[PDB]
Amino acid sequence: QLLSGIVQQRNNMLRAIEAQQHLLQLTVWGIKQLQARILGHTTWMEWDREINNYTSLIHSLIEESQNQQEKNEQELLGG
Amino acid sequence: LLSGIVQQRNNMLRAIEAQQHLLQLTVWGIKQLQARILATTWMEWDREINNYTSLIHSLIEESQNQQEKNEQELLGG
Amino acid sequence: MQLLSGIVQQRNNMLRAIEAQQHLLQLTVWGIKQLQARILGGHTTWMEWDREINNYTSLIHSLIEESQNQQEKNEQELL
């Protein structure tokens, strides 16, 4: 019931943290590329597409985490 | 009828949400730099960074306080 | 009995992962600002930045992996 739903919620939040870690690593890559130029456009197109896909996945996982949060709260009410 | 562990507010998911706002701000910042390197609004970006950074650290601190209360309730039997 | 314990134990590692990812975020913000002040010695400082990224990335992957291990234990307990 409630503990089951909590465990299922943790799975989605953990996937979101993992996907956000990937997004972080992509931002680290972009910062490093620009720093090496200070001190191609196809590669940046690939960077943009990886950002888009992981951002889209994260928003999906957040939304499903939000949906499970409401199910859990309604599960707790009334019991 | 239940333990407070299973009812407390999910500030962890709130932190995940706010960290995604920060990530998307850093993506925007990187994209602007990229457009000039390869060839005001930045105060607004700085402000938004600071606001979400302040929010996230508040959620982390509250999540840590919940964690301490969760552990103590486990110990209370 | 043990499921509630495992749920609490996982929350600790997931919160630690979120904290470590926040420090990674702050490091990327630092790098973005350094490049922005340039547009609109330092080699050692950037190596120090690179070293902090690596240390926090390694910590995050460790906390994620152990959060996943506890997720599996929790799911198996439910089964």
8 Å CB contact between A38 and C38: yes
- Residue A56 corresponds to which tokens in the numbers above? 């889209």
- Give the residue from A10, A18, A15, A7 showing the smallest Cα distance to A61: A15
What sign results for the dihedral spanned by CA atoms C48, B56, B70, A4? negative
Q: B6, B67, B69, B73: which to substitute to probe chain C, counting the most C Cβ within 10 Å?
A: B67
Domain range A1-79, CATH architecture: Orthogonal Bundle (1.10)
For chain A, give every domain's residue range: 1-79
The DSSP string of B18-31 is HHHHHHHHHHHHHH
Q: Which chains touch C (3 or more CB pairs under 8 A)?
A: A, B
8 Å CB contact between A32 and C32: no
- Solving technique: X-ray
Task: Report the length, in residues, of chain A.
Answer: 79
Q: A13, A61, A63: which to substitute to probe chain B, counting the most B Cβ within 10 Å?
A: A13
What sign results for the dihedral spanned by CA atoms A54, A59, A62, A68? negative
Q: Which of residues 19-48 of A touch B (CB under 8 A)?
A: 20, 23-24, 27, 30-31, 34, 37-38, 41, 44
On whether any CB of chain A is under 8 Å from the CB of C53, the answer is yes
Backbone interruptions in chain A following residues (C to N > 2.5 Å): 39
CATH of domain B1-77: 1.10.287.210
- Residue C19 corresponds to which tokens in the numbers above? 């904290």
Write out B14-66 in H/E/C secondary structure: HHHHHHHHHHHHHHHHHHHHHHHHHCCHHHHHHHHHHHHHHHHHHHHHHHHHH
Please tell me which of the candidates A21, A31, A38 has its beta carbon nearest to residue C21. A21
CA distance B35 to C3: 51
Resolution in A: 1.9
On whether any CB of chain B is under 8 Å from the CB of C14, the answer is yes
8 Å CB contact between B29 and C36: yes
CA distance C53 to A25: 9
